[PDB]
Each structure stands twice: as structure tokens, then as C-alpha cells.
Amino acid sequence: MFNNEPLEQIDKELHDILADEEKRQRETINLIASENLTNGAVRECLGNRVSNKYSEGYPKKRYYGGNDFIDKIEELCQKRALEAFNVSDEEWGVNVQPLSGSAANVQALYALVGVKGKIMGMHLCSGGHLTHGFFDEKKKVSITSDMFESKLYKCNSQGYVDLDAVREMALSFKPKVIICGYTSYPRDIDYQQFRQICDEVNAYLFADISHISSFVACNILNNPFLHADVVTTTTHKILRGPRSALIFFNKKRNPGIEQKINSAVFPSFQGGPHNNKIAAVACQLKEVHSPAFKEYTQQVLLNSKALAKALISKQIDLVTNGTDNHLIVVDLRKFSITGSKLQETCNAINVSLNKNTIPSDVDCVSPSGVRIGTPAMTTRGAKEKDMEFIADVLARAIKITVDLQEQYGKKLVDFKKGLPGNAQLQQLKQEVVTWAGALPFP
Amino acid sequence: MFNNEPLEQIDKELHDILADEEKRQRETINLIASENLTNGAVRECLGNRVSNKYSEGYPKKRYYGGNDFIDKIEELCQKRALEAFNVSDEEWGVNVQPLSGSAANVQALYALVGVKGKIMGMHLCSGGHLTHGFFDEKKKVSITSDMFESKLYKCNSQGYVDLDAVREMALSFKPKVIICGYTSYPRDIDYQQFRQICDEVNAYLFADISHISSFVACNILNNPFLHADVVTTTTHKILRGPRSALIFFNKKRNPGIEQKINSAVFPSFQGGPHNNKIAAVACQLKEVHSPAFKEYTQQVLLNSKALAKALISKQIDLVTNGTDNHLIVVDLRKFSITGSKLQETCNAINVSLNKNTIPSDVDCVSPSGVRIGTPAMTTRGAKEKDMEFIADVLARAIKITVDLQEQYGKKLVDFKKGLPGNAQLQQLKQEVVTWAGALPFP
Numbered sequence: 001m002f003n004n005e006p007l008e009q010i011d012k013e014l015h016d017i018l019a020d021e022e023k024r025q026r027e028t029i030n031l032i033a034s035e036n037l038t039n040g041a042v043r044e045c046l047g048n049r050v051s052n053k054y055s056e057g058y059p060k061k062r063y064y065g066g067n068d069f070i071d072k073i074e075e076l077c078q079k080r081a082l083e084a085f086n087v088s089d090e091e092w093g094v095n096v097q098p099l100s101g102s103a104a105n106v107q108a109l110y111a112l113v114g115v116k117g118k119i120m121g122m123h124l125c126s127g128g129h130l131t132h133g134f135f136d137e138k139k140k141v142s143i144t145s146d147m148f149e150s151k152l153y154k155c156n157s158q159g160y161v162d163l164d165a166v167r168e169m170a171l172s173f174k175p176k177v178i179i180c181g182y183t184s185y186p187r188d189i190d191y192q193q194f195r196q197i198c199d200e201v202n203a204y205l206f207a208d209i210s211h212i213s214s215f216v217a218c219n220i221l222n223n224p225f226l227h228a229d230v231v232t233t234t235t236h237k238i239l240r241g242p243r244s245a246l247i248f249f250n251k252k253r254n255p256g257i258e259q260k261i262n263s264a265v266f267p268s269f270q271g272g273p274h275n276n277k278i279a280a281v282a283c284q285l286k287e288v289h290s291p292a293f294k295e296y297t298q299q300v301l302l303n304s305k306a307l308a309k310a311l312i313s314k315q316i317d318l319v320t321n322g323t324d325n326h327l328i329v330v331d332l333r334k335f336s337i338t339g340s341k342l343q344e345t346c347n348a349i350n351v352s353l354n355k356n357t358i359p360s361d362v363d364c365v366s367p368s369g370v371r372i373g374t375p376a377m378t379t380r381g382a383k384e385k386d387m388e389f390i391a392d393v394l395a396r397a398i399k400i401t402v403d404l405q406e407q408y409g410k411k412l413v414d415f416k417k418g419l420p421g422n423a424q425l426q427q428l429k430q431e432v433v434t435w436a437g438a439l440p441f442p
Numbered sequence: 443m444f445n446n447e448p449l450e451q452i453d454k455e456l457h458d459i460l461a462d463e464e465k466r467q468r469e470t471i472n473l474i475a476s477e478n479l480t481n482g483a484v485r486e487c488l489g490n491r492v493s494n495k496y497s498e499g500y501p502k503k504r505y506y507g508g509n510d511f512i513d514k515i516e517e518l519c520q521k522r523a524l525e526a527f528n529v530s531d532e533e534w535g536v537n538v539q540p541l542s543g544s545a546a547n548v549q550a551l552y553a554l555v556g557v558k559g560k561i562m563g564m565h566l567c568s569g570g571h572l573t574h575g576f577f578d579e580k581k582k583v584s585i586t587s588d589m590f591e592s593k594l595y596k597c598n599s600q601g602y603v604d605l606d607a608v609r610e611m612a613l614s615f616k617p618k619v620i621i622c623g624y625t626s627y628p629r630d631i632d633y634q635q636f637r638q639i640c641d642e643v644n645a646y647l648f649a650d651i652s653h654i655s656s657f658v659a660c661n662i663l664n665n666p667f668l669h670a671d672v673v674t675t676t677t678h679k680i681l682r683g684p685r686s687a688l689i690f691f692n693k694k695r696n697p698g699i700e701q702k703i704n705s706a707v708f709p710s711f712q713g714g715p716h717n718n719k720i721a722a723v724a725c726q727l728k729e730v731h732s733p734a735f736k737e738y739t740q741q742v743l744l745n746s747k748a749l750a751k752a753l754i755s756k757q758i759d760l761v762t763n764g765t766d767n768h769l770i771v772v773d774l775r776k777f778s779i780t781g782s783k784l785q786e787t788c789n790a791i792n793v794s795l796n797k798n799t800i801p802s803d804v805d806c807v808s809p810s811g812v813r814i815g816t817p818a819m820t821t822r823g824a825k826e827k828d829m830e831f832i833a834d835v836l837a838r839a840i841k842i843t844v845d846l847q848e849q850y851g852k853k854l855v856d857f858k859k860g861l862p863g864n865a866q867l868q869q870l871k872q873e874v875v876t877w878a879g880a881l882p883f884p
């Protein structure tokens with residue numbers, strides 16, 4: 001007693017918009033540092049009937065039976081995760097049920113410290129995530145600031161993590177956890193010195209490597225597994241997985257953390273897992289381990305270096321003046337434009353990027369930068385030589401953004417009015433669309 | 443720079459298990475009350491490239507641009523949700539970003555009362571959910587018992603909600619929120635009466651209708667929208683959507699609830715929405731509003747009534763001696779077997795059901811029942827006449843279970859030893875497999 005008609009016949013209204021979305025992605029220069037494009041096989045898993053099944057609990061300890069085939073997929077996923085991150089299944093455990101990065105971090109944080117527990121993280125304005133304890137004067141913005149007691153450690157004026165400030169804070173504040181790994185930080189992390197500070201205060205070391213997961217997996221960047229008690233990561237960014245998250249815990253350093261983490265995910269926070277997620281994750285974790293994916297991850301860093309270098313050749317300032325990873329943050333202060341204005345401009349030319357804060361900003365309203373990343377475009381086949389052209393389009397967009405701000409003024413309302421119909425934008429968009437439109441598309 | 447090979451070629455190991463899982467669903471009598479089978483269209487949405495997009499925030503307030511099409515999908519879903527549940531968009535709002543039921547309830551509860559907030563809900567043993575405040579003296583099992591202060595109200599010895607007990611507790615406990623709507627409750631709710639208690643204490647009325655959503659939507663059962671401040675529901679059970687959740691809030695009764703709820707979902711708890719879910723949800727929400735889906739919902743009740751009656755005709759006891767909805771809970775005490783034993787037995791014959799507590803029970807180890815429901819089988823085309831055969835199969839399994847307990851004893855390890863190779867079970871399985879394999883499969 002069901003309607004089995006295909007999507008186009010059953011819901012033409014929705015199917016048009018999705019064909020629209022597909023086309024916009026096809027014709028966009030996507031520089032969102034956190035975005036990627038999944039292959040057909042990962043999306044076959046997302047659409048699989050495995051999502052029909054309720055399997056609360058863990059493998060071989062299901063509440064319900066009929067979870068033989070589901071148990072194999074959940075076990076194949078955890079095996080593959082421990083493999084991809086080069087850790088012994090004897091030494092590290094992994095939980096594959098968190099629905100997204102934000103859920104994974106709140107869950108893992110809870111396990112370690114509980115309600116009212118003390119945590120430390122990087123400020124949002126310096127590149128930290130919301131789930132690293134972010135709050136404001138006006139309100140406790142993240143649950144992580146409300147259910148926990150959180151202190152935030154700023155980066156220095158050059159955009160680097162200042163460990164002295166971390167230590168001075170750690171000693172006075174005395175938290176149970178210190179978080180490292182960030183949302184928009186363009187350099188590598190010194191996990192060793194984080195571990196040193198954590199031992200001084202007897203705090204746990206939490207590394208959130210969602211943005212740099214692929215680098216860590218393929219030994220391109222520093223390895224937090226050597227020093228961290230907990231490692232969280234999302235699966236949908238540089239890793240090229242579905243939208244999901246993983247929690248890694250170090251049994252040797254902390255026996256009986258396996259149960260604490262596992263009970264936090266369920267039944268403390270979540271109910272039934274999403275088995276289509278878990279299957280999709282497993283499918284991508286196979287690909288991660290292959291030598292082909294390392295090459296891709298290497299290519300992300302090459303493109304990221306080339307992009308930074310080309311932007312500097314056109315007199316654009318980058319926070320920390322470069323990058324060790326897939327992402328860059330452009331400081332726009334010398335151009336007297338805001339990140340929000342540049343974003344609109346770039347949306348009008350089918351260039352995807354996000355506004356971002358820089359060290360000098362005192363508030364998240366009117367941030368002075370934009371953040372870009374290479375994983376999506378590297379997925380679409382762009383090489384180092386293609387980066388000059390991307391850098392070219394961004395500089396032209398910065399120029400137009402200045403021109404339009406000169407004409408209509410700095411108020412965003414007024415600035416946006418200049419945007420529709422602009423000859424140069426129509427010309428730049430068209431250029432963007434022609435080059436983007438022909439790049440390989442999974 | 444990607445691998446576009448289909449799932450079968452890319453990952454033969456995973457693809458086998460999913461074909462296996464597909465076969466087991468096809469050849470199972472699925473009586474899990476919370477399970478259903480999604481159509482091909484809903485799975486096309488879950489596999490859509492729309493999950494590539496990051497769109498933190500809400501429509502027309504996205505952090506990033508390039509969300510023109512994603513904004514349309516999110517609005518079409520919120521529209522369709524309010525249509526489906528017969529509520530005016532001037533009077534009620536809906537949030538479509540929660541990733542799953544447990545997340546939606548934690549989010550909504552936080553919105554209403556905050557950390558340390560006082561809440562009341564039905565006990566797990568009596569048919570409440572984990573996210574309704576469940577704890578044990580030994581441990582705060584749910585974050586809802588830990589990040590909130592919760593009190594738990596039991597059903598009477600006949601398995602009914604006792605409102606006197608609710609009021610006696612509300613007046614002394616003084617909670618800010620009172621939760622009704624349940625995970626394994628076979629009767630309808632007196633929402634009007636819950637509102638009356640809430641007003642007396644000045645508490646919010648929270649109705650979780652995940653199990654009965656369709657009945658509420660198509661008007662077969664009581665309407666909590668008439669009396670409730672907040673209504674939560676999952677989309678994957680009787681509603682037949684994907685694995686996701688919806689939070690409804692009454693603007694009229696409480697202005698500025700819209701921001702409080704929306705702020706709780708983001709940025710308080712979650713980050714990026716899962717846009718494939720929202721697309722998938724929109725697709726099912728169209729189907730929900732059709733007069734055809736009402737017919738299916740009506741059929742779920744007709745089949746649930748017929749099933750209860752046939753079980754009773756075979757002298758099987760049902761909690762509350764019947765049902766108003768899609769689910770039944772069987773009291774196994776007169777047979778001196780546990781629900782855990784019947785569940786293994788049933789898994790051996792490809793019948794999916796789950797163990798469940800009853801009012802007499804004092805423990806979630808050795809619960810004295812099983813819970814069954816008709817939505818999945820109604821989805822597969824089974825009618826009233828087919829229920830005798832299901833009832834016949836369950837009675838036979840109950841009989842076989844008693845025989846095996848007689849032969850190998852009551853210890854579960856010893857009992858399980860009896861199952862492999864049993865002639866009657868092998869015969870019963872094949873009887874099941876022949877009837878199940880024939881039924882329409884979306």
C-alpha cells in the first residue's frame with residue numbers, strides 16, 4: 001500500500017529545485033573549506049534500505065534482533081576507521097554513531113567531564129568551533145558553554161595559537177578538557193605542547209580534526225593520535241564522506257573510557273543510529289586508505305599552496321601569510337571592504353566562499369575576511385596552474401566590490417543594490433560558469 | 443580526481459551485505475512498532491547531491507550564500523509540515539533541522555527550560571522514551587535526567603496513564619515542562635487533561651507524537667495541537683519518512699518561542715543541516731497530505747484492531763486489553779516466558795518484534811512482554827484477514843518458546859542453545875519466508 005513512482009512524477013515541484021541545485025553546484029567555483037562532493041557510491045549507501053532499521057545499542061548488544069547484517073556494517077565501519085587513521089584496534093576505540101560533528105563533540109565532551117564540567121577551547125573569532133565552548137557577553141551561544149564551564153583562549157595578533165596564553169589560562173582555570181583542532185585555522189597544530197599543558201593540569205587532550213582529517217590520515221600533517229585522549233572528526237569535508245561523525249578514544253591512556261564514550265552517544269544523547277550513514281561512511285573509509293586518495297590529499301595541499309602564493313603575488317594579505325593545509329583566510333582590511341560584501345559579490349559570480357573573522361576584529365558582526373579552501377575544487381580536477389585563474393577571479397571580485405562600495409557606500413542594504421545587473425559581474429559569472437561547468441563532476 | 447565506479451564494483455564487500463539486508467527485510471514479518479519502509483522517491487532524496495551543501499542558520503539568514511535552492515527546499519518542507527498537521531502558519535511554527543527524535547526532544551526541552559530546568563515525563567518501564575527524562579537510581583541514563591532535573595510518572599497496574607498521579611506530582615514537583623506522547627503506549631492521550639495540569643502549575647505542555655504522528659495528522663486520534671505548546675515528532679515511523687525529526691511550537695500561546703526553539707536547534711546543539719533529510723522529508727510530507735495516505739493510516743488501525751482481537755481469541759493477554767492505535771504490547775506472564783526469549787525465538791523465524799516491559803515489571807532485564815505494531819506490514823499490503831496468520835505465527839512461537847524453556851531451562855544462554863536447527867522453527871521460518879517474500883516491497 002505505497003506509491004512507487006519515481007521522484008520526477010511523484011514530486012515534480014521538488015525534483016526541479018534539486019535539478020536546479022545540481023546545476024548550481026556544477027557551475028560554481030566552490031571554495032567553502034568545509035565542503036566536498038561525494039561520489040555515486042557513497043550516495044547509493046545514503047539511499048539504501050538499510051535506513052529502515054532500528055538498531056539501538058552497539059554490535060552484538062542490540063536491543064532488537066534482526067541486526068546481523070547491520071552488525072556487520074557497523075563493525076566493518078569501525079575496523080575501516082581505525083585502519084584509515086593508523087591506530088591499533090587494541091590501543092584505540094571508535095564510535096561510528098554520532099549523526100554530525102556537533103553531536104559528536106558534545107557527546108565526547110560530556111563523557112569526559114559531565115554537566116558543569118570545565119573545558120577550554122579556541123575562541124570562534126580566532127578559528128574555534130561553536131562546540132568548543134563558544135559564548136558571548138549577551139548569551140551562552142553553544143550548549144558547550146551552558147552545560148559546561150568554558151574558558152576561551154585567543155590566538156595572537158599574527159593569527160597563531162599562543163601556547164603561553166593557553167598555559168597561563170590552563171593553570172588558573174584548571175579544566176578537565178582542553179580542545180585543539182579548529183574550524184578556520186590555516187596552520188598545523190603542535191599537539192605535543194598541548195599534551196604537555198594538559199599533563200600539568202591533569203586535563204584530557206581533545207583534538208577535533210574535521211577540517212584536516214585527510215591530512216592526518218595520510219601522514220601529511222602532524223598526528224594527534226600520538227598525544228590525544230580523544231579525537232573527533234566529521235566525515236563530509238576533506239575526507240569526502242557523508243554527513244556524519246567519528247569519535248576516537250585512547251584506551252591505554254584511559255581504560256574504561258570506551259564505555260563512557262559509548263554510553264554518551266547512546267543512550268545519553270542519541271537513539272537509533274542512521275545505518276545509511278554508517279554504510280556510506282564505510283564505503284568512503286575504504287577509499288581513504290587507498291594510495292589514490294593520498295594523491296588527492298597531496299593535491300589539496302599543493303593547490304592550497306599555489307592558491308595562497310598566487311593571491312600574495314596580487315598583493316592580497318593572508319592570515320599567517322600562508323598555509324600548511326587546505327584552507328586560507330584572506331584579510332581584507334587593506335581594501336577597506338568587509339567579508340560580507342565580498343561574499344555577496346562572489347555569490348553573484350557563482351564563487352562559493354564564507355565570511356570569516358580575523359585577529360583584529362572585536363566582534364563577529366562585520367568580519368574583515370573570507371575563508372577559502374581547495375578540497376571541493378581539487379575533487380573536481382583542478383591542478384596548481386588552475387589556481388592563478390581562481391586567484392584572478394577573487395582579485396577581480398575584490399576590485400568590483402571596492403568599485404560598488406565607492407558608488408553606493410558601505411551600508412550593506414545600499415551595497416547589495418549595486419549588485420543586480422552589473423556588467424562586469426555578468427561577465428565574471430559567465431567566465432566562472434564556463435570554466436566550472438566543464439570540470440569533472442561526481 | 444574521483445572514483446565514479448558503482449557501489450558493486452567499488453565496494454563488493456559492503457554491497458553484498460546490503461543485498462543481504464535487502465533480502466532479510468523482504469522475507470521478514472516486521473512487527474517493530476517504530477519501523478516502516480520508505481519508497482523509492484524518499485531514497486532518491488536521501489541520495490541527492492543536496493547533502494553537499496553547508497547551510498548553517500535558517501532560510502534568508504544563511505551564513506553562506508549560494509543557498510537559493512536550499513532555502514526553497516527548507517521553506518517547502520516547513521510549509522508542507524504545517525499543512526500536513528492541519529495548523530495555521532500564523533499560529534504555529536516548525537523547525538525541520540533536527541537530525542533525529544532524540545536530538546529534537548533534547549533541543550526543544552532545552553529551549554523551554556534550560557540547564558537545571560525541571561521536567562516531568564513518563565517512566566521508561568511504563569512506556570516513556572529515554573529523552574523524556576529517564577534515569578535509574580544507579581545512573582542518569584539520559585542526558586535529559588542529567589542536564590535537567592526530572593521526575594517520572596508511572597502508569598497504573600492496568601497499563602493506563604493515571605492523571606491523579608501526574609497532578610499529585612506536578613503540584614509537589616513544580617516542573618516547567620510536562621511531557622506526554624510515548625514510545626510504547628497502546629492507548630490515546632487525554633491532552634486536554636494534560637493542559638489542565640500544566641496550567642495549574644504554570645508548566646509547558648510537551649507532546650511527543652512520533653509513534654502516532656499519522657493518526658494525529660489524518661485526524662483518527664486526539665489532536666495535541668489544540669492544547670500543546672510544543673509538539674515533537676520523528677519522521678521515520680508511522681509517517682513513513684526518512685530518519686529525521688520536526689519540532690512544532692505554538693506562537694500564539696507563547697510569543698518569542700520561535701527564536702528560543704530555533705536558537706536551541708542552532709547554534710546551541712547542531713551545526714550544518716542535513717539537506718538530503720529535509721528534501722526527503724518534504725517529499726514524504728506531500729504524500730502525507732493526500733487522501734490516499736489517510737486510507738493507509740486507517741488501514742494501520744484496522745490491522746492493529748484485528749491483530750489484537752486475534753491474539754485475544756488465542757487467549758493471549760494484551761496490556762490495557764486492546765489498542766487505540768498501531769501498537770500492541772503482549773503480557774507473557776501467563777506463559778512463564780520472558781520477552782527476551784520470545785524475541786530470539788521470533789528472530790529465528792524471521793519475525794521482527796522487540797521485548798518490552800509491562801506494569802508488573804520492576805526491571806529492564808527480564809521484561810515480561812513484547813511490543814508489536816502494524817505500520818510496516820500495512821505498508822507491505824497486508825489487510826485485516828492476514829492478521830490471523832500473524833497472530834497464528836506468534837502463538838506458535840510462544841508455544842515453541844515454552845517447549846524450549848521446558849527442555850533447556852530458563853537461563854538465556856542455555857535457552858538460546860535450543861534454537862539452532864529446531865525442526866519446528868525451520869518449518870515456521872519457511873512458512874514466514876514464503877508469505878513475506880510474496881508481499882509488495884517498496
Ligand SMILES: Cc1[nH]nc2c1[C@](c1cc(N3CCC(CCC(=O)O)CC3)cc(C(F)(F)F)c1)(C(C)C)C(C#N)=C(N)O2
Nearest residue numbers: 124127128129130141183354355356357364365367498505
Ligand atoms: C557558521 C560557523 N560555524 N562554526 C564556525 C562558523 C564561522 C562563523 C560563525 C559566526 N557566528 C557568530 C554568531 C553565532 C550565533 C550568535 C547568536 O545568534 O546567538 C553564529 C555563528 C559568524 C561568522 C562571521 F562573523 F559571520 F564571519 C563566522 C564560519 C566558519 C562561517 C567561524 C568563523 N569565523 C568559525 N570559527 O566557526
Ligand SMILES: Cc1[nH]nc2c1[C@](c1cc(N3CCC(CCC(=O)O)CC3)cc(C(F)(F)F)c1)(C(C)C)C(C#N)=C(N)O2
Nearest residue numbers: 056063566569570571572583625626796797798799806809
Ligand atoms: C530501546 C528503547 N528506546 N526507547 C525505548 C526503548 C524500550 C526499551 C529500553 C530499554 N533500556 C533500558 C536500559 C537503558 C540503558 C541502561 C544503561 O545505561 O546501561 C537502555 C534502554 C530496555 C527495554 C527492555 F529491555 F525491554 F526492558 C526496552 C523499547 C521500545 C525497545 C522501551 C521500553 N520498554 C521504551 N519505553 O522506550
Ligand SMILES: Cc1ncc(COP(=O)(O)O)c(CNCC(=O)O)c1O
Nearest residue numbers: 034100101102129182183210713714
Ligand atoms: C572543527 C569542527 N568541528 C565540528 C563541526 C561541526 O560539524 P556539523 O556541522 O556536522 O555539526 C565543524 C563545521 N564547521 C563549519 C565550517 O567549517 O564550514 C568544524 O569545523
Ligand SMILES: Cc1ncc(COP(=O)(O)O)c(CNCC(=O)O)c1O
Nearest residue numbers: 271272476542543544571624625652
Ligand atoms: C516518543 C519517541 N521519541 C523519540 C524517539 C527517538 O527517535 P530517534 O531514534 O530518531 O532518536 C523514539 C524512538 N523509540 C524507539 C522505538 O519505539 O522503537 C520515540 O518512541
Ligand SMILES: [Cl-]
Nearest residue numbers: 046276277488
Ligand atoms: Cl542521511
